[PDB]
Amino acid sequence: ASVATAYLTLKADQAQLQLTKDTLGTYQKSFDLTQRSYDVGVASALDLRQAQT
Amino acid sequence: DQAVSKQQYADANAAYLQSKAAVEQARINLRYTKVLSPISGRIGRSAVTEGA
């Protein structure tokens, strides 16, 4: 029972690690879109800081 | 970069063209108040003088 629970929590943590990596990718795409929209002056230095956080 | 989509560019471009049309109307009204000859020829005298 213990080795079954350990293998299943290993698979679950690898799956949600992959999902967290995909959310990091989408957040990085949001950040460099906001950085592109910050240099020319559409977005101020508040939405850029929110995307950075 | 497709961070602000095409519709929010299209209405801004429409506002830009409407402002160009308003400035062209005002440039016509300021091209008047210096009344130009419509055609070229020998001119008569001023009916109203400087000040009327």
From Swiss-Prot, chain A:
Disruption phenotype: Disruption of MexA, MexB and OprM significantly reduces active efflux of N-(3-oxododecanoyl) homoserine lactone/3-oxo-C12-HSL/PAI-1, but not N-butyryl homoserine lactone/C4-HSL/PAI-2. The chain holds residues 176 to 228 of 485 of the full protein. The lineage of its organism: Bacteria, Pseudomonadati, Pseudomonadota, Gammaproteobacteria, Pseudomonadales. Induction: By growth under severe iron limitation. Belongs to the outer membrane factor (OMF) (TC 1.B.17) family. The outer membrane component of the MexAB-OprM efflux system that confers multidrug resistance. Functions as the major efflux pump for n-hexane and p-xylene efflux. Has been shown in one study to be involved in the active efflux of the autoinducer N-(3-oxododecanoyl) homoserine lactone, thereby playing an indirect role in quorum-sensing; but has been shown in another study not to be involved in efflux of this autoinducer. Over-expression of the pump increases antibiotic and solvent efflux capacities. It comes from Pseudomonas aeruginosa (strain ATCC 15692 / DSM 22644 / CIP 104116 / JCM 14847 / LMG 12228 / 1C / PRS 101 / PAO1). This is Outer membrane protein OprM. It comes from the Bacteria. Changing residue 41 to A: Abolishes complex formation. It is found in: Cell outer membrane. Component of the MexAB-OprM multidrug efflux complex, composed of six MexA subunits forming a hexameric tube, binding to a MexB trimer, which interact with the trimeric OprM outer membrane channel protein. The OprM homotrimer forms a 135 Angstroms-long pore. It consists of a beta-barrel, which is probably inserted in the outer membrane, and an alpha-barrel formed by alpha-helices which probably spans the periplasm. In the ground state the periplasmic end is closed, while the outer membrane end opening is 6-8 Angstroms in diameter.
UniProtKB/Swiss-Prot annotation, chain B:
Changing residue 45 to D: Abolishes complex formation and thereby decreases drug resistance. It is found in: Cell inner membrane. Changing residue 5 to D: Abolishes complex formation and thereby decreases drug resistance. Disruption phenotype: Disruption of MexA, MexB and OprM significantly reduces active efflux of N-(3-oxododecanoyl) homoserine lactone/3-oxo-C12-HSL/PAI-1, but not N-butyryl homoserine lactone/C4-HSL/PAI-2. It comes from the Bacteria. Induction: By growth under severe iron limitation. Belongs to the membrane fusion protein (MFP) (TC 8.A.1) family. In both X-ray crystal structures approximately the last 100 residues are not ordered. The periplasmic linker component of the MexAB-OprM efflux system that confers multidrug resistance. Functions as the major efflux pump for n-hexane and p-xylene efflux. Has been shown in one study to be involved in the active efflux of the autoinducer N-(3-oxododecanoyl) homoserine lactone, thereby playing an indirect role in quorum-sensing; but has been shown in another study not to be involved in efflux of this autoinducer. Over-expression of the pump increases antibiotic and solvent efflux capacities. Implicated in the secretion of the siderophore pyoverdine. This is Multidrug resistance protein MexA. It comes from Pseudomonas aeruginosa (strain ATCC 15692 / DSM 22644 / CIP 104116 / JCM 14847 / LMG 12228 / 1C / PRS 101 / PAO1). The gene is mexA.
